[model samples]
Target: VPFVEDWDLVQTLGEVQLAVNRVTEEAVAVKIVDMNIKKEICINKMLNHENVVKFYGHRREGNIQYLFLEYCSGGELFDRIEPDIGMPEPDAQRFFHQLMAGVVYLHGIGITHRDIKPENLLLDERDNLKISDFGLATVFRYNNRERLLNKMCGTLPYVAPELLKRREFHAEPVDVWSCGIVLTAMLAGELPWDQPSDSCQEYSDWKEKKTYLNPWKKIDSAPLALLHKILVENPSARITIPDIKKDRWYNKPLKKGAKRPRVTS
Candidate 1:
């Protein structure tokens, strides 16, 4: 066997476990899946960025396929965030920058992570954010030409508003919208709303500026300024990654020791 299961359970969602490579004896994460992982494998294998999870290939054992991935000791970004209070400013700033770096790289390569959320963002031992779980990823551009996407993908709260109102949407803008949502979650310690749709009163109210919400209320003026541009209702008007990098709030220096503070559950 290429990998030996050392810790049977490492996280929720899938059948992921911590294991050791028999030959290398190095710790790694193994996602044991029963079926086709072609798309995920194709997308992940092509990604090589500091802020993105490392995919070391895969192993097939009869009917099951073991996906070898980097073992992130710091666990999910979601866990590091407090329930309703969010992380301190420095911690949120650092992770948001790291997250944007990863997203920019993915978009540069024509790939869009349809699902971008705290659960999919992992932290390494050094507390650096790593984007993971490419199962919903897809290519939006090739040979200098871009293609629009039609399928509605992504977690509810993190999804862009265009996805709910339109049949086709630009992949990059949707991703930017999700990143804005992530920033809100990191700043306020909770989701701004269940989802971004007219049916969700919180989202509708926020859309019309009916009330100031908790999560958004908790966010300070600096990052909140960026969030306003990112959370624009129109996809065409939403902030792009390139423009986001130029924003004043996005370029601010992170506070020293930017790791999230330990929290009691």
Candidate 2:
């Protein structure tokens, strides 16, 4: 689904009925309000790629809107990679490659995803990655305008330090930071920064102490290096798409029998 807003169900029975028959795909659902027209246009303009979810046209009924999207049989990646029951290394690598391919395509087109999390990434029946949820995405012009953005919009755990500081920073580098966190979660099945609290105390702790409780001490050397490069504190030092593609983890031959850690907890 593109985006959804609140509305009374009884009052919009006709629209709801139309939504039921039209929603052919598992991920495609009805959207109520239209918030970001520019971003929607950007998503519609995106070209086809195997790892990226295809945006099939959109529909409108009175004030209601529906964004048609490719059906994802496997469902959300966040749900698929259960925190207590993570996938194997081979599976993680495969999904990682697919995600990288999609991100690379977006970066090549001068677009910044701005949101790269497990929930935003859908999968097909064969577990092929499909990057979705471009609601926070924006296009940048490196030649004419400043690429550093100050907007603080994205999941907190996956957000970069510069973004948290509310400083001008490149969107692509921030995306890399989020990708790094995602890769870490894929390997370890939990985020390094998640703390025991319901309030903003956890985030406060992060800012006060830079408390990244790295639990992936067992992650292989190659992937560790990649993570470090991508999650660098300095936005300029963070790994770019080309740099990630050239990393040893991406290019190195996997040692046979190097499986993912079995989810026991």
Candidate 3:
């Protein structure tokens, strides 16, 4: 006898997952909305990457649009960090590096993820990253551009301050800000900002002060400094992709025959 994992339809807000074929192992994510034609366009535009969730094809059933995608076995990255207290620095560095690679690829193709939280980053059976949920993503051109987006989109905790200020901003830097927050959460198993409530007052304080309410008291200095650089209130002063690549953590020599750390519950 062989082992098997069953696939089933999972319903989420604004969308529904349907098991396409049990035997063949396939499922489709259907977004039921009025005049929703972006599914096909998004599927076609998304670039392929090992760390990016693969979008297959789309189908229409009346007013519903189905987006076929790869099924990830390892679940959300946030889930992995939550129960175990936190991941070691080396593990976090590996995941963060892979995530940046995906982001770099997306930017290369003129697409902005807009959202880069841990919940949106899925993992496979091998514990590799797969960035998903591109509903909030946008594609911009290099040439003549129209008015920058003013829509207050993305999860507030991971959102860039400029977004809440309602100021036009470069999408890449904003995404990097969220990536920094994600790294903090992965290493601390909690939001860097103490208050998770959606109150504008607390959020305003964080943005204005450029500090976390209950900072990770136990984190090492190296990662702390890295977080500060990444989440700098000034986007211009924040650590860019080039800066991250040059970080000592990324280039640190690994012990001979050292294996990657595993997530222990």
Candidate 4:
């Protein structure tokens, strides 16, 4: 009885619950996993950043195991977004910048967050973006060499087109492509297509750089400039995080009194 449960479900997939530590009385988001915990634990414990959700520790209560994470009161990033309308431009840009910083830090440490989506992103008390859910993450680099991963993972709508082939793919580029999808979803308030495959007509048009579609028609020219670069079909041709940061739209100054999240290499 070290933690008292609020019993309010935060997330259903892993059965996350709001709880308070009995001794410290500190609020925490407790994730209850049934059988698979090793991978999530192994990868999450190594992360440290303002934009990445904090993994405090883990414990077991009889047969059920619990993962204690920093409690975020602002809720999921998707909740802040309005379907088909999206958040205001300033807010979206700030969140995207924070997301890039979090991703940059993860990649810097050789970790790839295979699943990058609004649902997996949370907002802390200050409304800062915090990347969460390391269940689909893995290490792609060690020492000086990088490895190619083969498993097809991540949500279909947000996954990179290369992963749809179910073949070997570079882990880093996959995340970059997913970031593109996330940005579009933010701007359009819905996915551009069900999935990025030839079978999906919407994706087929997008693969050919046809912007005469509903979502693309709605997006302004500013973000469109960067989207084209990130959503490239060839992995090698996709925009790198550094280059994304260099883009004029990405480097635009935030609104007054806004503090950009600090990220150190």
TM-score of 1: 0.89
Q: Which portions of model 2 miss their true places by more than 4 Å?
A: 1-38, 142-146, 194-214, 255-265
Q: In model 1, where do residues sit more than 4 Å from their true spots?
A: 1-14, 22-24, 257-265
Per-residue lDDT over 12-128 for candidate 1, one digit per residue giving the tens place of the 0 to 100 score: 544878875555567778888986288899998899999999998887889888888988889999998898888988888889889999999999999999999999999988998
Point out where model 4 deviates above 4 Å.
1-14, 258-265
Each model's TM-score? 0.89, 0.76, 0.78, 0.90
Pick by lDDT: 2 or 4, better one: 4
Which residue pairs of candidate 3 clash? none
Per residue, candidate 3 scores C-alpha lDDT tens digits across 1-265 of: 2423344565562254544455555554444444515843564455688878877666667866766676676778887785435776777777887899888888777777787898888877777888887778776544545336666678878887777664577777788889988987887787765333336565455455544454445466677777767877767778888788887666665323336788987
By TM-score, the better pick of 2 and 3 is 3
- Model 1: per-residue Cα lDDT at residue 244: 90
The residue-level lDDT of candidate 3 at 26 comes to 56
- lDDT per residue, candidate 4, 152-231, as tens digits? 88999999888987579899899999888889988889889888888999988887778978788878788888899999
User: How do the residues 138-240 of candidate 2 rate in per-residue lDDT, one tens digit apiece?
Assistant: 8764555647687877887788777766567777787788888888888878776652223555445533443344344646678877876776666887788
Q: After superposition, how far is residue 69 of candidate 1 from its true place, in Å?
A: 0.8
Q: Give the higher-lDDT candidate: 1 or 2.
A: 1
Please report, in order, the local distance difference test score of every candidate based on alpha carbons.
0.86, 0.69, 0.70, 0.86
lDDT agreement of model 2 with the native: 0.69
- Specify the poorest-scoring 10-residue window by lDDT in model 4: 5-14
